[PDB]
Design a protein around this nucleic acid. Structure first.
Lengths: 53, 83, 36, 69, 153, 127, 269, 84, 476, 68, 37
RNA sequence: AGAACGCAGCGAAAUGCGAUACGUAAUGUGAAUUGCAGAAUUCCGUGAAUCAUCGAAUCUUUG
RNA sequence: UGAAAAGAACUUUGAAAAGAGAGUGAAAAAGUAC
RNA sequence: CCACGUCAACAGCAGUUGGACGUGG
RNA sequence: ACACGUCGCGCGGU
């Protein structure tokens, strides 16, 4: 991850959390970065590429 | 004869364009003096409507954003493509 | 690709055409030449 | 006749001119915003300020007529 | 305009480079510039590269102020080694440009001797340092412009 | 240039009056260059306010002997570009070259209808 | 059958007859201290200036509300802040503002003109024109001899035409001297031009008649000729800048018109 | 592999101060560099957890370490420094 | 997947040319020189003859078919530059199938473009073989091996020269094109030739126009134009050659409106307010390439029908073998089976003077319309214009320091792009068929292609060059 | 497309695209009618006439009918 | 503090913060541009 | 009297005018105007002015 | 700064800035608070 | 603030980072 | 409207 201040913030926002808990995959980190949109991060959540602790 | 044009311009932006899609909603930037009734009338006579809600608030553009929902039978796709 | 590396001579390209224009006159009529 | 300022405009009566003015204003309101466009255009500047310049003429005639009675 | 300032070269037996308005110390880079020296570009380079690891810094002649008491080198007619890798990065950037200008040249190859190098006050950045009762002292953040010219011998 | 005397601005203000006052039709005075002797005889005059299509030769510079149509002349700057030279930099980075009208002499006129009438019908001072 | 009697010289000219006496007024010892004193007295009365401004002080409220620290008040000043002021500015001391009296106006200079002193000044000035050799020293050149200071006809008034001025100027020779006045040294005065100073031309000759002036419309203009009358003339015309011995040209009628006076003031030495 | 026990009885009781762990990680990195005969020594987050668990005070004295090699040589050296 | 792969194995590639370049310098000055050579060969085909016992383009390659293969034919040279456009029809098919599995030797899975370049060289030779084996060279099905060899060399060589020069432009060292350029060149030559062709002429006027052909319009002049108002008709004394002229006149007005019609939608939201640049999209010229390939398909269809029916499989029954191979014949004209799908996609053999078929006209319009739009949708994928390429392009410029507001600025590009492409090709394919009916030169479809390419490309070329204003750039 | 199955049914989708297209698109505007014609036309003529020109030389080699 | 009420006073200041100068450059090229900002 | 805030195609700097928003007009001049990039208008008689009008039609908000 | 912006094209180097060389001009130790 | 694009200046070093710079919402 | 079983929907669970 790089520049993913915004994606930690946005991914946390869609799963309604304080940002410590939300998890992002190391392998598919590039594909997580190609989000930017609130309906885009929903697909990533369904994939399991973004999860919630 | 002491009245004003209401609409200064339509605002087009990401959120403005999305409103057209969602529920036939145009959004305008209207004069700082602009009252609600005159917006309802003006949109009627520039787009053959009826309006099913007007609500208005400030913007740092100074000109007052006016969020105007329109009737179903209208079609907001062709007539937002006529502006 | 090609095993030859020269393909901008600017030629070879002219050589192929040049032989072609010459041969067809001997082979065939175009101004009352003999036809082979 | 073929347009659109100034000799055609300044001596015209006047209901016709007002009707034309609101539909020339509709060209510019159709071409707003944005829809400005890319432009400027000089036509957008000119017809915006032709609305101004000949709203001087209509209000001027009313003012000068009111000082003849 | 500028360079040399000790003009003898001449450009069919020369190469040149300059840094300009770079934010790296006037005080420390003058000592590096006087030290480089002289020495072809590979010797200048692989003193400075080893300096990053271990091999000090480069001998300080005149800006030799205390400090503690010192130490291990080198110390080849100096005794006050310090380690500003900040000015090493600047002179490495000067040398790589100089060696690339001196690779299109086509001249070469034993030759060399860094023939003049001079540091110009770019100026001082001027900032402030907090202390007592609304009274604030100066803080300079040291920087410089620099010029480098090398000749055949 | 201007004739003596009335206003007794010594003065760099006298220069500022030339530089900053007087848009296009008293730049007509400062956009004038002498006529020839043939076209002086033809219209009886002396000098003429420049057209953008009158042709003019340079007399008093370092560029002192080229003809050309006037490509532009600027009211605020009182100065003439001549077509062209110019001077290229190789990729089409291109240059103006500017001149002062009283350093030029006009060769071939384009001179126009009532334009030549108004000029020959008394000068001054009807503005 | 002589005394100060003179031979007349016309501008036709190439002369024939005789003139009237050269005045008794044209004698007196040539006194340069009075000549310089009168020249400065007359020039002062017009003179004044401009300078800096703002106020000629004083934006800039005070008393001396100086506020210590070190090194003292300074000596001075006050109002105020981050500028501007210290001192500053209200000076002097000025890295910014005024001087210790902005040019003052105020400062009444003058010399007023006494009746006796003015007629002594004119009489001494008239006697100062009567010389010769000093003309070269002032810096103007005369080839022709003798008939001096030059005397010319009444016909001088009636021109009008440019070419007849040239015809007048060949006779007095002279000529070449006015050609010097149309020549660089004429050049280009800098900042001193506004109030005159200058860089770096000389003057030329002064032509005086009598009944006229004359100063007719043509006679004003020429490279550095000056034109005058016996009734009204001054030391700026008679020796500009106060370094005596101008090249002077007169006309006839001048003697008799000068001769009769009352008032009272006459020659002695 | 090779298995080495790194003598952190040497100096790691003597430091502290306050700040043992970052010096200790650097000490493991150049000790392992010397033993292995290598450039980069990996340092996995397994070892980082191993040193930071008991927490600066706060090290389970000497540590056994399983180390692999190398012949790569320079270009993308393999020194695993965790368990192999 | 919709198509199979074909061998492109590594030793096989080395055998066939694809050009291994020598040293070159990427400079604008070089690029135009090569483009000129390619253009020159097209003319030379008309100048130079070819060996054969009938050959001069009198070998019956059929009237509709001959024009939109293109070889600058109708004087001298039969097939020539024809093979290349068939090769380019392959490039699309293969790319748009977009194989992921299975599909014979990789580098032909949507990298099918690079496969095609190697294969283009084979097909120059290979197209000649197709000509003799169908009996379009008057074969009794093998007139002699040696005679067929002597024609084959003439046919392949002319288009081979162009194809070598094509590689040298498509290896990022041209601005020109070999393939696109020749198709347009032939059609311009055809229009003026047809108008002054001899179609029952007693006498020339005293001129033989700008060639060596006399005409109907020559005859009118010798007797004064005053004889047709002293006559009981105003037509069919000059109508055959007048048809060719008015064909162009119908086309002329409608193309220029379409060039003007563009979906502009500028998106170049500024720094320093308003907008400081422009952005437009070519509405119809994105779909240019689809229509050329559609016309090329129909040209190939005529040959495969005849070969399939009689001399590949069957005869047992004509309809059984295929519907296109139905009643394969030379008919009253062309060939042109008189029945099947192939019959419909051709003129009625009267150029719209009979439209009371009824059936024939109906099928032709709808089928062509659907085929053109199909190639527009397959053009989007990885062979042409999509929004995803353009998104990256606009980031470099920054959209003149973009308006920027998320996420619609990125979204705005993707949504419009499929809708526009579909419309572009759908419109042209309808129009082309109607052009044949009103008046034709031998293909009214071809006239429409000619004006679209020629007017537009001149405007493009100068801008690419480094120049502006649509001035010269011929060898500069 | 073919929602109820009638010819009006697939028309509707293409209308959504079309309605945009007719309002925003325009002809070459007076200067540009002449400009496009001017830039080509000589260019349209030359391509057509080069193939015409070759033929002037080529037939009268066999028998002079206009010479070449 | 208490002013003539009101939301309206806040609104005119809010526009003024945008309307603000900020910034550019291209006129400084063609003037007469004595450094400002 | 003065002042706030707007207005623009751009808006750094100045002052030009008020939601009609550097407008334009009536006397008037002559080949160039929109400061500039861009987008345009004119050019052998209706584009363009403060060269001059203590001259003018519009005229928000505050005083 | 200069008569005129001619305010430095093109090439190599450099993460970028800049540097080297070259171009403009009467003069660049006249190259941008000149 | 939010979102995207940047590093000349600013950040007490440095920078692939920012509350800075730039444009919008 | 929360959550697992589902490739997605649907269907099952409180």
């Amino acid at each position: 991850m790089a520049n993913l201040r915004t994606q930690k913030r946005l991914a946390a926002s869609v799963v309604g959390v304080g940002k410590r808990k939300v998890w992002l995959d190391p392998n598919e980190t590039s594909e997580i970065a190609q989000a930017n949109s609130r309906n885009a991060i929903r697909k990533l959540v369904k994939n399991g590429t973004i999860v919630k602790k | 004869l002491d009245s004003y044009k209401v609409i200064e311009q339509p605002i087009t932006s990401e959120t403005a364009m999305k409103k057209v899609e969602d529920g036939n909603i145009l959004v305008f930037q209207v004069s700082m003096k602009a009252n609600k009734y005159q917006i309802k009338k003006a949109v009627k006579e520039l787009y053959e409507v009826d309006v099913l809600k007007v609500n208005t608030l400030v913007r740092p553009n100074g000109t007052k954003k006016a969020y105007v929902r329109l009737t179903a039978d209208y079609d907001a796709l062709d007539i937002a493509n006529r502006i | 690709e090609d095993s030859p590396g020269l393909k901008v001579g600017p030629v070879p390209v002219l050589v192929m055409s040049l032989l072609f224009i010459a041969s067809v006159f001997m082979l065939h009529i175009w101004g009352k030449y003999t036809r082979s | 006749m073929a347009g659109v300022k100034a000799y055609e405009l300044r001596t015209k009566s006047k209901e016709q001119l007002a009707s034309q003015l609101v539909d020339l204003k509709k060209e510019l309101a159709e071409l707003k915003v944005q829809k400005l466009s890319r432009p400027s255009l000089p036509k957008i500047k000119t017809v915006r300020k032709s609305i101004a310049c000949v709203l001087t003429v209509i209000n001027e005639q009313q003012r000068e007529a009111v000082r003849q009675l | 305009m500028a360079r040399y300032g000790a003009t003898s070269t001449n450009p069919a037996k020369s190469a040149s480079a300059r840094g300009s308005y770079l934010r790296v110390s006037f005080k420390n880079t003058r000592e590096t510039a006087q030290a480089i020296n002289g020495w072809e570009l590979t010797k200048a380079q692989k003193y400075l590269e080893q300096v990053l690891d271990h091999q000090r810094a480069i001998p300080f002649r005149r800006f030799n102020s205390s400090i503690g008491r010192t130490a291990q080198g080198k110390e080849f007619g100096v005794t006050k080694a310090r380690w500003p890798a900040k000015s090493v990065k600047f002179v490495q950037g000067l040398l790589q440009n100089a060696a690339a200008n001196a690779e299109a040249k086509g001249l070469d190859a034993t030759k060399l001797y860094v023939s003049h190098i001079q540091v110009n006050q770019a100026p001082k950045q001027r900032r402030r340092t907090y202390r007592a009762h609304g009274r604030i002292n100066k803080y300079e953040s040291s920087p410089s412009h620099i010029e480098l010219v090398v000749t055949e011998k | 240039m201007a004739k003596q005397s009335l206003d007794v601005s010594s003065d760099r203000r006298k220069a500022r009056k030339a530089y900053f006052t007087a848009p296009s039709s008293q730049r007509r005075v400062l956009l004038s260059a002498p006529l020839s002797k043939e076209l002086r005889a033809q219209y009886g005059i002396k000098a003429l306010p420049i057209r953008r299509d009158d042709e003019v030769l340079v007399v008093r510079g370092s560029k002192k002997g080229q003809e050309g149509k006037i490509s532009s002349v600027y009211r605020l700057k009182f100065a003439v570009q001549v077509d062209k030279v110019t001077k290229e930099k190789v990729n089409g980075a291109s240059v103006p070259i500017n001149l002062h009208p009283s350093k030029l002499v006009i060769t071939k006129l384009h001179l126009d209808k009532d334009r030549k009438a108004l000029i020959q019908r008394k000068g001054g001072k009807l503005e | 059958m002589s005394r100060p009697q003179v031979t007349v010289h016309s501008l036709t000219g190439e002369a024939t007859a005789n003139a009237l006496p050269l005045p008794a007024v044209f004698s007196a010892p040539i006194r340069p201290d009075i000549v310089h004193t009168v020249f400065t007295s007359v020039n002062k009365n017009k003179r004044q200036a401009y300078a800096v401004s703002e106020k000629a002080g004083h934006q800039t409220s005070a008393e001396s509300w100086g506020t210590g620290r070190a090194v003292a008040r300074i000596p001075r000043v006050g109002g105020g802040g981050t500028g501007r002021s210290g001192q500053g500015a209200f000076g002097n001391m000025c890295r910014g503002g005024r001087m210790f009296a902005p040019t003052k106006t105020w400062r009444k200079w003058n010399v007023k003109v006494n009746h006796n002193e003015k007629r002594y000044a004119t009489a001494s000035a008239i006697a100062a024109t009567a010389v010769a050799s000093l003309v070269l020293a002032r810096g103007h050149r005369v080839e022709k001899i003798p008939e001096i200071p030059l005397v010319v006809s009444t016909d001088l008034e009636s021109i009008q035409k440019t070419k007849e001025a040239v015809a007048a100027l060949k006779a007095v020779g002279a000529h070449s001297d006015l050609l010097k006045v149309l020549k660089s040294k004429k050049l280009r005065a800098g900042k001193g031009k506004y109030r005159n100073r200058r860089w770096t031309q000389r003057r030329g000759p002064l032509v005086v008649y009598a009944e006229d002036n004359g100063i007719v419309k043509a006679l004003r203009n020429v490279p550095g000729v000056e034109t005058a009358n016996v009734a009204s003339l001054n030391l700026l015309q008679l020796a500009p800048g106060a370094h005596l011995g101008r090249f002077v040209i007169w006309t006839e009628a001048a003697f008799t018109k000068l001769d009769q006076v009352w008032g009272s003031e006459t020659v002695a030495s | 592999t090779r298995e080495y026990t790194i003598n952190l009885h040497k100096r790691l009781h003597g430091v502290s101060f306050k700040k043992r762990a970052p010096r200790a990680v650097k000490e493991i990195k150049k000790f392992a560099k010397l033993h292995m005969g290598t450039d980069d020594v990996r340092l996995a987050p397994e070892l980082n957890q191993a040193i930071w668990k008991r927490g600066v005070k706060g090290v389970e004295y000497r540590l056994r370490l399983r180390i692999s090699r190398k012949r790569n040589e320079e270009e993308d050296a393999k020194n695993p420094l965790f368990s192999y | 997947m919709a198509i199979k792969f074909l061998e492109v194995i590594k030793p096989f590639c080395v055998i066939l040319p694809e050009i291994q370049k020598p040293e070159r310098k990427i400079q604008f000055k070089e690029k135009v020189l090569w483009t000129a050579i390619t253009l020159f060969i097209f003319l030379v085909c008309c100048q130079i003859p070819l060996f054969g016992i009938m050959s001069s383009d009198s070998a019956d390659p059929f009237y509709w078919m001959r024009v939109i293969l293109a070889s600058n034919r109708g004087t001298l040279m039969e097939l020539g530059i024809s093979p290349i456009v068939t090769s380019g029809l392959i490039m699309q098919l293969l790319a748009g199938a977009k194989i992921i599995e299975v599909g014979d030797t990789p580098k032909d899975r949507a990298l099918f473009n690079g496969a095609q370049k190697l294969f283009g060289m084979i097909i120059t030779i290979g197209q000649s073989i197709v000509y003799v084996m169908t009996g379009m060279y008057g074969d009794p099905s093998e007139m002699g091996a040696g005679i067929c060899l002597l024609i084959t060399i003439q046919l392949f060589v002319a288009g081979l020269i162009v194809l070598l020069l094509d590689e040298l432009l498509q290896k990022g060292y041209g601005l020109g094109s070999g393939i696109s350029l020749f198709i347009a060149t032939n059609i311009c030559e055809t229009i003026v030739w047809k108008a002054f062709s001899p179609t029952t002429v007693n006498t020339g006027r005293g001129m033989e126009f700008e060639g060596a052909i006399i005409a109907l319009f020559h005859l009118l002049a010798t007797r004064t134009d005053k004889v047709r108002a002293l006559r009981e008709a105003f037509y069919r004394q000059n109508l055959p050659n007048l048809m060719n002229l008015i064909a162009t006149i119908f086309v002329f007005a409608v193309v220029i409106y379409f060039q003007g019609f563009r979906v502009d939608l500028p998106i170049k939201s500024a720094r320093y307010r308003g907008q400081y640049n422009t952005y437009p999209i070519k509405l119809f010229y994105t779909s240019n390439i689809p229509i050329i390939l559609q016309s090329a398909l129909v040209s190939n269809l005529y040959v495969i029908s005849q070969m399939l029916s009689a001399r590949f499989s069957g005869n047992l029954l004509v309809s059984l073998l295929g519907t296109w191979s139905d009643t394969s014949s030379g008919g009253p004209a062309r060939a042109y089976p008189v029945g099947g799908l192939c019959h419909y996609l051709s003129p009625p053999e009267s150029f719209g003077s009979v439209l009371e078929d009824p059936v024939h006209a109906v099928v032709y319009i709808v089928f062509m319309l659907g085929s053109c739009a199909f190639f527009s949708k397959t053009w989007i994928e990885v062979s042409g214009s999509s929004a995803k390429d353009v998104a990256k392009q606009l980031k470099e410029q920054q959209m003149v320091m973009r308006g920027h507001r998320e996420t619609s600025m990125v979204h705005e590009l993707n949504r419009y792009i499929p809708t526009a492409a579909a419309f572009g090709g759908l419109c042209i394919g309808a129009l082309s068929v109607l052009a044949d009916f009103l008046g034709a030169i031998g293909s009214g479809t071809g006239i429409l292609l000619a004006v679209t390419i020629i007017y537009q490309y001149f405007e493009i070329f100068v801008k690419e060059q480094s120049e502006v204003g649509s001035m010269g750039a011929l060898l500069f | 497309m073919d929602q109820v199955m009638q010819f009006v049914e697939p028309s509707r989708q293409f209308v959504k695209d079309s309605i945009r297209l007719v309002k925003r698109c325009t002809k070459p505007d007076r200067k540009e009618f002449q400009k496009i014609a001017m830039a080509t036309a000589i260019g349209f003529a030359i391509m057509g006439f080069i193939g015409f020109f070759v033929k002037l030389i080529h037939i009268p080699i066999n028998n002079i009918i206009v010479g070449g | 503090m208490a002013a003539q009420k009101s939301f309206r006073i806040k609104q005119k200041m809010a526009k003024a913060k945008k309307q603000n100068r900020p910034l550019p450059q291209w006129i400084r090229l063609r003037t007469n541009n004595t450094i400002r900002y």
